[PDB]
Design a protein around this ligand. Structure first.
Ligand SMILES: Cc1scnc1COc1cc(Cl)cc(-c2cc(-c3c[nH]c(=O)[nH]c3=O)cn(-c3cccnc3)c2=O)c1
Ligand SMILES: Cc1scnc1COc1cc(Cl)cc(-c2cc(-c3c[nH]c(=O)[nH]c3=O)cn(-c3cccnc3)c2=O)c1
Lengths: 298, 298
């Protein structure tokens, strides 16, 4: 019983964080096999309008200092892929877990291991927003921290932190260096664009609430089309038959039809929560996927 | 920028979780040096009214099966301390971190590594409630999961999970086996007693909100005594000069006097939040200590 924002155990990722220093810039890197991955702005004052190609040409292998705890790595190769720097080192990380690199979809969640100077300081869960930002918790020095999921023994790396926008939300790349969203690694104004609420995740959280005994919001039914009208009015993502199918296991376990749950959600959107709480929250929570609910309620 | 419920990196504790089996009961244990710690109800059907002394007498060392991943440990000793069982094994955990056993005070926070069958499944932060329960996230099989803090390289173990009460909140012990609160390890009705809100933690979170740009709730001043009148009316812990002194660093960094912040809090208690949010929450959050705020805002 109980429902919490739960991160994955971070041990397997803790073993791969290192510090990367270039000139006087220092940030975090990810050491997997014999490759270290970090944001290419480690090579930047220059960040206002950088020519990354030109700046990397002034660099040689020995200009990159890589420290794994108290262990110094020997950099024997370096290349740029999209917005990540890849540093070939002479040693394979003995702590390399089984892993993959994944580009997650908006709405999916992942655990963030926040790191400074190559040392982990905290773990927390968050979601890729529909507008490809994340609402993280990061201070200067946190660049190169990574987000991940764990399936059995395999770590799926999906996020490397690059930037805090002036609005205070965060932007980064997948581990091949492609930004999520329209962002570029330059210190210049950048619009994120309208965000929306992750509808399928809010429904999954209503199912979690029912599983936990919070039932007051159950009431009617609706149509996929009728609901999507109300979704649009309150800046919720449109619900698709694909989303309905993903909620099937929770619908089967609770006995509540998905469109019945949509009808509950519609009444909460149209009438507010009335000072009451659901799973300890006075707002509709959208950062639990259907998988997160099943994991934590299974 | 940003503020999140952040757990400690769990790696150092992941290395100490094992599975403990007795008869057909299986739960989690904590392997530190050559000792494994687990809830004594592993030796219990019997849980309605157990004579733990009598039940442990029927047991011998070889009745306790201890599995560390795929490694079997040899149990060479066993004893009961308060409500924990201590199993002497033949091998010292090579992964034992530097550690201590601590009994935390109500209001303090810790990270919980939720585990099943000796395998970690998730990490999250929570607080010891004033009434010595915790509002965790635990399913059957989670007993023996532990809560901890980390200071530099030292793990301070403060909590081992034993019980879910019928109200759905959770009860457990320190690592010497003394329950927090009035609870006993028996499946019989048990009152937790009135809880209250952790006042000093709510203030610390208001300072975090100011540090992050959420300033709308700043307004007046008050007296320690006047505020405590309002604290009592809304079931908040009384504020002491000790609490004021602990908030000093945040008061100094923000330039906001503690009693000025108390006056803001008083107006939020007396008028509600008016549909607005603070750090993304529509309720006053009390599970961040002043230390948690400084760590995450430093
Ligand atoms: C988009 C707009 S518009 C006006 N301004 C911006 C922000 O523009 C950028 C662009 C780039 Cl390319 C990088 C950065 C950035 C760099 C570092 C950094 C630099 N050096 C270093 O040694 N270590 C580091 O960590 C840290 N953080 C940072 C701070 C707080 C939270 N999260 C990240 C950053 O945002 C910002
Ligand atoms: C106080 C009152 S009044 C009416 N009822 C209660 C609850 O009474 C107790 C007493 C004791 Cl001594 C123990 C328990 C308990 C045991 C186990 C358990 C048992 N076996 C095993 O092999 N593995 C396990 O995990 C698990 N969970 C549990 C479940 C969900 C979340 N968290 C914990 C438990 O609560 C309950």
């Amino acid at each position: 019983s109980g429902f919490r924002k739960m991160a994955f155990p971070s041990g397997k990722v803790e073993g791969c964080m290192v510090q990367v220093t270039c000139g006087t810039t220092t940030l975090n890197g990810l050491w997997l096999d014999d490759v270290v991955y970090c944001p290419r702005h480690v090579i930047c004052e220059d960040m206002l309008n950088p020519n990354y190609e030109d700046l990397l040409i002034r660099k040689s292998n020995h200009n990159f200092l890589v420290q794994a705890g108290n262990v110094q790595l020997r950099v024997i190769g370096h290349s740029m892929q999209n917005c990540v720097l890849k540093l070939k080192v002479d040693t394979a990380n003995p702590k390399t877990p089984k892993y993959k690199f994944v580009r997650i979809q908006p709405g999916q969640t992942f655990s963030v291991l926040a790191c400074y100077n190559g040392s982990p300081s905290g773990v927390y869960q968050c979601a890729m927003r529909p507008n490809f930002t994340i609402k993280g918790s990061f201070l200067n020095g946190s660049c190169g921290s990574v987000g991940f999921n764990i399936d059995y023994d395999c770590v799926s790396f999906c996020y490397m932190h690059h930037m805090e926008l002036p609005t205070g939300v965060h932007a980064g790349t997948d581990l091949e260096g492609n930004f999520y969203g329209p962002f570029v690694d330059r210190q210049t104004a950048q619009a994120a664009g309208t965000d929306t609420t992750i509808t399928v995740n809010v429904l999954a959280w209503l199912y979690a609430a029912v599983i936990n005994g919070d039932r007051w919001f159950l009431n009617f039914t609706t149509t996929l089309n009728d609901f999507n009208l109300v979704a649009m009015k309150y800046n919720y993502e449109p619900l698709t038959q694909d989303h309905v199918d993903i909620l099937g296991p929770l619908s089967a376990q609770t006995g509540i039809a998905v469109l019945d749950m949509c009808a509950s959600l519609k009444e909460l959107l149209q009438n507010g929560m009335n000072g009451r709480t659901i799973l300890g929250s006075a707002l509709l929570e959208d950062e639990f996927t259907p998988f997160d609910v099943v994991r934590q309620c299974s």
